[PDB]
Write a protein that binds this DNA or RNA. Structure first.
Length: 138
DNA sequence: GGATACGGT
């Protein structure tokens, strides 16, 4: 069962459609910042007043950090791009050291949790409400 | 397992 990002809470597993806003690779993991243009009180409030950021929106509490480890990292690092639409299935949520929600994909070689992320074609109607909502904020 | 909304590798 799919949730809107407004609906997700810490320390569960969930699934959602989203757009990728920001990527960052490192030698430990791959990070996505993603949104479905719904608000969550535990999301970081992104400021439009920061000087010099490459972030162009959405602002306020509208996006979530996803940390991708191991096979998820290796698969996505050079594949998932800023602007892409994704569907993410059976991922874990937690709270960071400051009280903010984030999503995690741990390594799962034993294939216990059936986690996945894959690209979604821009034309898929599953993305329609994301698109409809994004019009509110541009 | 990383470590704060940047950095744009």
């Amino acid at each position: 069962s799919f949730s809107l990002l407004s609906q997700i809470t810490p320390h569960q597993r969930c699934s959602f459609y989203a757009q990728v806003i920001k990527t960052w690779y490192s030698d430990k993991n791959f990070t996505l910042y993603v949104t479905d243009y719904t608000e969550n009180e535990l999301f970081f409030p992104m400021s439009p007043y920061t000087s010099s950021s490459r972030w162009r929106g959405p602002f306020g509490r509208f996006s979530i950090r996803c940390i991708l480890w191991d096979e998820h990292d290796f698969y996505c690092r050079n594949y998932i791009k800023e602007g892409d639409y994704v569907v993410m299935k059976n991922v874990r949520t937690k709270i960071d050291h400051l009280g903010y929600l984030e999503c995690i994909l741990h390594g799962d070689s034993a294939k216990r949790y059936n986690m996945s992320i894959e690209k979604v074609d821009s034309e898929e109607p599953e993305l329609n409400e994301i698109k409809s909502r994004k019009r509110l904020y541009v």
